[PDB]
Amino acid sequence: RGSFVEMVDNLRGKSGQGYYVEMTVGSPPQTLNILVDTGSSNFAVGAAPHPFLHRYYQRQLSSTYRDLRKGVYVPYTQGKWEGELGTDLVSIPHGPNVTVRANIAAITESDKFFINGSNWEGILGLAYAEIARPDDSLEPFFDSLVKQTHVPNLFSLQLCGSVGGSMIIGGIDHSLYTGSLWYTPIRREWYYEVIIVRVEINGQDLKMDCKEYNYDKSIVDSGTTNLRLPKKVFEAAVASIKAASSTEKFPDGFWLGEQLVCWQAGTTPWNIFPVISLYLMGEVTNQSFRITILPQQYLRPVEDCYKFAISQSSTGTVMGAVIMEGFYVVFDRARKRIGFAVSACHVHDEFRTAAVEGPFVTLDMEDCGYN
Ligand SMILES: C[C@@]1(c2cccc(Nc3cccc4cc(Cl)cnc34)c2)COCC(N)=N1
Ligand code: NA
Ligand code: NA
Numbered sequence: 001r002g003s004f005v006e007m008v009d010n011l012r013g014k015s016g017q018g019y020y021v022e023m024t025v026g027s028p029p030q031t032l033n034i035l036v037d038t039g040s041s042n043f044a045v046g047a048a049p050h051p052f053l054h055r056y057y058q059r060q061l062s063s064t065y066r067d068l069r070k071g072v073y074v075p076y077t078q079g080k081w082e083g084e085l086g087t088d089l090v091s092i093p094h095g096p097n098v099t100v101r102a103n104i105a106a107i108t109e110s111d112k113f114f115i116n117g118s119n120w121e122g123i124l125g126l127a128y129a130e131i132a133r134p135d136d137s138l139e140p141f142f143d144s145l146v147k148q149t150h151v152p153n154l155f156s157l158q159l160c161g162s163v164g165g166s167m168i169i170g171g172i173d174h175s176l177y178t179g180s181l182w183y184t185p186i187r188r189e190w191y192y193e194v195i196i197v198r199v200e201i202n203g204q205d206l207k208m209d210c211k212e213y214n215y216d217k218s219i220v221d222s223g224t225t226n227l228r229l230p231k232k233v234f235e236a237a238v239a240s241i242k243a244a245s246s247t248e249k250f251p252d253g254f255w256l257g258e259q260l261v262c263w264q265a266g267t268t269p270w271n272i273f274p275v276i277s278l279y280l281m282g283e284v285t286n287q288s289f290r291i292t293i294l295p296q297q298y299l300r301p302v303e304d305c306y307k308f309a310i311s312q313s314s315t316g317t318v319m320g321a322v323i324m325e326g327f328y329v330v331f332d333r334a335r336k337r338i339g340f341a342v343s344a345c346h347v348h349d350e351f352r353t354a355a356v357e358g359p360f361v362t363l364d365m366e367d368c369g370y371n
Contacts, residue, residue: 001170001172002171002173002174003168003174003175004168004171004173005173006094007094007095007166007167007168007169007173008166008173008175008176009164009165009166010022010092010094010095010164010166010167011036011157011158011163011164011167011248012033012119012157012163012164013119013162013163013164013165014117014118014119014162014163015077015161015162015163015300015301015302015303016225016300016302017060017115017117017118017119017120017127017164018035018036018118018120018160018223018225018321019036019163019222020033020034020036020119020120021033021034021036021092021094021095021124021167022034022093022094022357023090023091023092023093023124024060024090024091024092024093025045025057025062025088025089025090025104025312026057026058026061026062026063026064026065026088027062027063027064027088027089028061028090028202029091030055030057030058030061030062030212030246030309031093032045032046032055032056032057032120032122032183033053033054033120033121033122034120034121034123034124035061035120035123035124035223036124036126036157036167036192036222036223037086037121037123037124037125037126037221037222037223038058038126038127038157038192038220038221038223038300038331039125039126039127039131039175039191039192039221039222039223039224039318040111040123040125040127040131040223041125041126041127041128041130041131041132041133041140042072042074042103042105042123042125042132042133042140043090043102043103043104043105043122043123043124043140043141043266044074044081044083044104044107044122044123044125045057045104045105045106045107045121045122045123046107046114046121046122046212047059047083047084047106047107047108048107048108048109048182050110050114051130052114052115052116052117053114053121054119054121054261055121056121057104057106057121057122057327059086059088059106062088064088064089064101065086065087065088066086066087066088067086068081068084068086068087068103070084070085070134071083071085072084072085072105072133072134074105074133075155077165079110079111079112079113080103080110080111080112081107081109081110081111081113081318082103082107082108082109082110082156083105083107083109084106084108084212085103085104085105085106085108085138086102086103086104086106086151087101087102087104088101088102088104089101089312090102090104090141091284092291094151095115095167096151096169096170096171098145098149098151098325100141100145100148100149100259101144101148102139102141102144102145103138103139103140103141105133107315109124114334116323123139123304124141125141126140126141126155126222126331127140127190127191127192128140128143128189128190128191129143129191130189130190131191131290133170137185138232142333144210145169146218146333151169151170152170152171152334153333153334154170154171154172154330154331154332154333154334155167155168155169155170155171155330155331155333156168156171156172156176156329156330156331156339157222157324157328157329157331158176158177158328158329158343158344158345159321159324159325159343160325160341160345161296161297161325161346161347162344165204165345167184170182172330172339175344176328176343176344176345177223177327177328177341177342177343177358178201178341178342178344179341179342180341181328181330181332181339181340181341181356182268182280182282182289182339182340182341182356182358183282183283183332183335183337183338183339183340184280184281184282184283184289184337184338184340185281185283185336185337185338186333186337186338187369188337189336190218191218191219191221192220192221192331192338193217193218193219194212194218194219194220194281194319194338195218195280195365195368195369196210196213196218196278196279196280196281196317196368197213197279197280197281197288197362197365197368198209198210198213198277198278198288198290198362199213199233199237199276199277199278199279200276200277200279200290201237201240201241201244201274201276201277202244202273202274202275203277204244205229206233206236206237206240208232208236209362209369210365210367211367211368211369211370212232212233213230213233213317213368214230214316214317214368214369214370215230215232215316215370216316216370217276217315217316217317218313218316218317218318218319219317219318219319220319220323220324220329220331221318221319221320222320222321222324223320224318224320224321225300225309225320225321225322226309226310226311226318226320226322227276227293227297227298227309227310227311227318227319227322227323228262228310228311228312228313228315228317228320229310229311229313229317229319230312230313230316230317231312231313231314233317234310234311234312234313235312236309237276238310241255241273241274241310242255244272244273244274245272245273245274247272248269248272250284250335254308257307257308257309257311259303260305260306260307261305261306261308262304262305262306263304263306264304265304266307267304268299268304268306270294270295270349270352271351272349273294273295273298273299274295275292275293275294275352276292276293276298277290277291277292278290278291278319278323279360279362280340281365281368282358282359282360282362283337283363284359286361286362286363286365287315287338287358287359287360287362288358288359288360288361288362289356289357289358289359289360290327290355290356290357290358290360291323291326291327291340291354291355292354292355292357293322293323293325293326293347293354294326294347294349294352294353294354295355296346296347296348296349297309297322297323297325297326297346297347298310298322298353300322305320309322310322316370325343325346325347326342326343326354327340327341327342327343327346328340328341328343328344329355330344340356341356342354342355342356
């Protein structure tokens with residue numbers, strides 16, 4: 001409890017390609033790098049020699065593999081994969097010293113799923129059974145982990161924005177954050193759904209009906225890059241950010257994520273860009289707290305050229321890597337709550353820092369949830 005030195009800095013990645021952890025599947029153990037995803041609930045790994053893959057799960061080499069004789073087809077907005085379901089023994093070498101039997105989707109065919117040039121070969125869906133494919137009877141990895149061992153029912157993530165970080169399975173490491181954790185309820189166990197109750201750009205309340213912030217939901221998602229906002233809310237959001245940054249100028253394509261913007265090095269104009277504050281529903285009636293991020297988070301380096309990493313959504317709010325990179329995030333499943341604290345490793349400058357502050361008084365917070 002409070003210290004897990006063997007799990008610190010167990011995450012790796014490249015900018016724009018996500019955060020992965022080392023895992024092993026099978027007996028004898030086969031090592032794979034696996035993308036950490038709080039926004040889905042399947043453990044799925046490449047199992048055939050797709051050209052983009054450094055390696056893949058070879059079931060024939062595992063004595064502990066059990067076939068479930070069942071297939072799954074998983075289409076996403078743009079990409080898809082299909083696989084064969086089975087179970088096997090799974091470990092996390094820089095995680096707890098346990099081995100569990102978990103469901104695994106052996107990916108046999110995929111389209112626009114694997115990234116050319118990336119160093120990961122599968123995905124670890126850490127969300128709940130409700131959104132597992134093909135249905136909620138396929139037990140997610142973390143559920144199996146907790147069912148089968150003494151690992152406490154929680155994990156935490158420090159995403160450090162080339163990239164790195166920590167996944168603490170079964171606890172919290174207090175070295176990884178400053179100040180206090182502040183918790184928001186998980187509204188429902190499907191995605192890690194939360195409720196946003198107020199939004200400010202540089203102190204300026206958007207003053208929208210707070211229902212709009214969570215239309216049709218708001219989720220915390222390590223498998224998405226952007227801070228994604230409901231269209232109606234995005235429209236208000238950029239309008240205020242554009243106006244806040246009207247000092248200098250960039251094309252209108254930039255704000256729709258349709259083109260990059262560039263400055264010469266040593267001299268990105270950070271200060272003309274506003275901070276973004278999300279107030280989150282608190283643990284107590286009429287009580288909220290707020291988390292604050294920087295352009296460092298929402299203007300993402302591409303290789304000094306940057307993408308604007310806030311975008312509109314038809315799927316609700318998605319607090320992706322743009323948000324999580326400012327914070328140590330505690331997925332306290334046991335108490336159905338999400339904790340945020342200022343990350344010890346977050347990218348900032350000498351003028352502004354990421355912030356987690358409270359308590360604030362906010363009335364009618366339950367009206368903020370969409371139904
Ligand atoms: C299943 C699904 C999925 C499927 C495949 C890859 C990813 N993740 C990613 C890909 C490429 C770049 C990334 C950079 C970051 Cl920071 C984080 N995830 C990244 C996520 C669908 O999309 C949303 C979701 N939550 N999970
Ligand atoms: Na247990
Ligand atoms: Na601390």
